[PDB]
Structures are given as structure tokens and as C-alpha cells.
Write a protein that binds this ligand. Structure first.
Ligand code: CA
Ligand code: CA
Ligand code: CA
Ligand code: CA
Ligand code: CA
Ligand code: CA
Ligand code: CA
Ligand code: CA
Length: 398
């Protein structure tokens, strides 16, 4: 009904502000001392029975050769991964489709190495791992098309059963296939190092669990881009999310026309002039009405995090993409409590009629005592005439 609808709209607006206030990309910076780069990012692994397992990545890349390389200005990669199974494959395996694009530098050149990536390039991946003494090997093959930032790879566990979930190896298992836009070609360290290649090293901290340490060599061997990796994992819990295999494999890419309609309702709460784009002025208006008070610089940074075309506004399509990702990957307890606190103004753990009234009428919706109570009632599982945390979580989940 049109009170379930008022939750969705208001809920989606609050989750849009949570996304814009988070750091979900691959952040790249120059490392002049090593003639390379550093990167850091957070990867979200959905836990099968509900919840999210966070993996915090720190990364270093250094050229294998002494040729000149491109040291970038600060930017990010935005990524999109889809995992599948080959229905005719009997071995323990993963099929990976990946798109990666560079952005984060607003609107206002090309290495010799970039010429090696103008068409489709065959890829080979080899990994040797040891997690808590559980050894394994992975072999992969496929191709990369950097013109579109596109990877297709199939991986086999050559040692039998993979002792960790496949999703935990995705980031370890060729950022030289990223699409850099024309205005960012001078910031592409990865292709610039080719064909001699680069060393990629990481430490990956699985929160409340162990860590991976990785070292990889990425270079051309003949016409093939090869990724050779060693992985060491330590201090994992015997029945944690990783060694207990509790992580989801296939995350939902299935996004209904009903869900898109819900996102467009939320969009139009921000896009108050109906021109199909959200400006810093429009984002700030909504945040102030929810009781936050961002500076111009914060608003610019929030938009920059999802601003695919670098024009300084969140276009409708950029808004749909950001919302699709936000529904695909589970929020942490901390992010859900932060959304809850937008409503629970007094912090007593209960969203009251007065509290939800105060939110709704500050967001500019004219709702009288009646439909407020209709909204409370829609979410009120236990009859107390208020919305508690668990009731909030249920309202917010698709
Ligand atoms: Ca992720
Ligand atoms: Ca990090
Ligand atoms: Ca994924
Ligand atoms: Ca290219
Ligand atoms: Ca607008
Ligand atoms: Ca834009
Ligand atoms: Ca309260
Ligand atoms: Ca209740």
C-alpha cells in the first residue's frame, strides 16, 4: 500500500546518503619512493544466512623493470563482479565476469604499454596458497578487453577442494585491464609498466578473523598477460566465515522493474527541480532536513564517490548504479544502526510516532497523525506502537 511505499522512498533516501558517506571504490595514490602506487579498499562478502563479512585491502604495486612508469594523481577504480558456475564443470571452480573503470578525477597522455591492450588479450592466472596450513593451487584462464574494462576468467582448484570460499580469492586472482577514460590516461600505472610488468602485494584483513598476505607477478609472457600469485593466510577461526564456508557465492544481479521504480522515487526526493541530476545544492538540502550539516567540500566528495562521468552531479543512471550496488551487498551492523539513528532522534532504541513525524515533515511530506500511525503500524511487528532496531532492519531489507 501507499505507507509501505513511504517506508521504501524514505528508507532508499537514507541508504543513498549512507552510500554517499561511504568509501566503496579502489583508492589509488602515487608511491614515489617505490616508483609505483598504493591502493586501499573494503570488499563486502555477503554471509549466506544474513550479514556481511568485511575484507580491508592494503595494496602496493612496483614495476619489475627500470623503464619509466606513469605515477598517478589520486583516483579510484569502480568495479562490478559477477560469479557463476559452469554447468558442465565437475572440478571445484569459479567463473568470473568483471568490469573495472577509473574515475574520481572531475573534468577540466597514453604510455607505450597501453598499446598492448587495444584488443582482446589472453590471460593466465596461477596461484599457490596456504591458509592456516590448508594448501591449495588455482589455475585460471580467459581474456581481457581493457577498451571496456572487461575480464572473463574461469578458475579451477587444481588440488581438489578449495579450503576457503571462492569469493575471498576474487581480488587476488589484473588491474591493467581497467578502462581509463581519455582524460585519465596519464594516471594508468598498470599498463605503463607493461610488458616487463609489476609486483602486486596485498594484506587483506577479514574483520573478526584472519588475514591474507599476497605477492603476485603480473607481466606479458609472449602475447599472454600472466598473473602468478603466492597467498599466505594465518589466524583464521576454524568455524569463522572463511574456514566454515559461510559466505554467499552468487550475489543477486536480478534487479526488478519494481525496484528501479522504488529507486526513482528516492531519486526524485533529491532531484527537486526534476532535471534528472542531483547537484551539491540538492544533496545538501536533503541532508540538512535529516539533521546533518555538510560543507560544500564534503558534498563535492560525496558526489565524486559515484560520479562516473566526472561532471560534478549524480545523474539518474549514476544514481541507479549506486543504488543497485547498495542492494546487492549487505550493510554492516554499524551502517544499519546509523540509518536507524536518522529516525531514532532520542537514541532510546525505538522510533516513535513523534520521531517519524519529525523526519517525514522535515523531508517535506505532508502526513497527518493518521498515515504516520499507518506507517508505524506497517513496520510494528510486536504491537508496541513504535519501531525498534529489529523491526527497522526488516523494513529496510528487500
Ligand atoms: Ca564489494
Ligand atoms: Ca582499507
Ligand atoms: Ca561479487
Ligand atoms: Ca586500451
Ligand atoms: Ca536536479
Ligand atoms: Ca555525473
Ligand atoms: Ca526514540
Ligand atoms: Ca514495535
Amino acid at each position: 500500500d501507499s505507507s509501505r511505499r513511504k517506508w521504501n522512498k524514505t528508507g532508499h533516501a537514507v541508504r543513498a546518503i549512507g552510500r554517499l558517506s561511504s568509501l566503496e571504490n579502489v583508492y589509488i595514490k602515487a608511491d614515489k619512493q617505490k616508483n609505483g602506487i598504493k591502493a586501499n579498499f573494503k570488499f563486502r562478502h555477503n554471509i549466506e544466512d544474513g550479514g556481511v563479512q568485511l575484507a580491508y585491502h592494503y595494496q602496493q604495486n612496483t614495476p619489475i623493470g627500470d623503464g619509466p612508469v606513469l605515477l598517478p594523481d589520486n583516483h579510484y577504480l569502480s568495479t562490478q563482479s559477477k560469479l557463476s558456475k559452469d554447468p558442465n564443470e565437475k572440478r571445484d571452480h569459479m567463473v568470473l565476469l568483471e568490469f573495472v573503470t577509473a574515475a574520481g578525477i572531475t573534468l577540466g597522455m597514453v604510455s607505450k604499454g597501453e598499446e598492448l591492450f587495444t584488443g582482446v588479450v589472453p590471460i593466465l592466472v596461477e596461484l599457490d596458497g596456504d591458509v592456516n596450513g590448508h594448501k591449495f593451487s588455482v589455475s585460471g584462464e580467459g581474456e581481457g578487453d581493457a577498451t571496456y574494462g572487461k575480464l572473463t576468467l574461469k578458475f579451477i582448484c587444481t588440488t581438489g577442494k578449495l579450503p576457503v570460499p571462492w569469493p575471498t580469492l576474487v581480488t587476488t586472482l589484473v588491474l591493467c585491464f581497467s578502462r581509463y577514460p581519455d582524460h585519465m590516461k596519464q594516471h594508468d600505472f598498470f599498463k605503463s609498466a607493461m610488458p616487463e610488468g609489476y609486483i602486486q602485494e596485498r594484506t587483506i584483513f577479514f574483520k573478526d578473523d584472519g588475514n591474507y598476505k599476497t605477492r603476485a607477478e603480473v607481466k606479458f609472457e609472449g602475447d599472454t598477460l600472466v598473473n602468478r600469485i603466492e597467498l599466505k593466510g594465518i589466524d583464521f577461526k576454524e568455524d569463522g566465515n572463511i574456514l566454515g564456508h559461510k559466505l554467499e557465492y552468487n550475489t543477486r544481479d536480478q534487479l526488478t522493474e519494481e525496484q528501479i521504480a522504488e529507486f526513482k522515487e528516492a531519486f526524485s526526493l533529491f532531484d527537486k527541480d526534476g532535471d534528472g541530476t542531483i547537484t551539491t545544492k540538492e544533496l545538501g538540502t536533503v541532508m540538512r532536513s535529516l539533521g546533518q550539516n555538510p560543507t560544500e567540500a564534503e558534498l563535492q566528495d560525496m558526489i565524486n564517490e559515484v560520479d562516473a562521468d566526472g561532471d560534478g552531479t549524480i545523474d539518474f543512471p549514476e544514481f541507479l548504479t549506486m543504488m543497485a550496488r547498495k542492494m546487492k551487498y549487505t550493510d554492516s551492523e554499524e551502517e544499519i544502526r546509523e540509518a536507524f539513528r536518522v529516525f531514532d532522534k532520542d537514541g532510546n532504541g525505538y522510533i516513535s510516532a513523534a520521531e517519524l513525524r519529525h523526519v517525514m515533515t522535515n523531508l517535506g511530506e505532508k502526513l497527518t497523525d493518521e498515515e504516520v500511525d499507518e506507517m508505524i503500524r506497517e513496520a510494528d511487528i510486536d504491537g508496541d506502537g513504535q519501531v525498534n532496531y529489529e523491526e527497522f532492519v526488516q523494513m529496510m531489507t528487500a
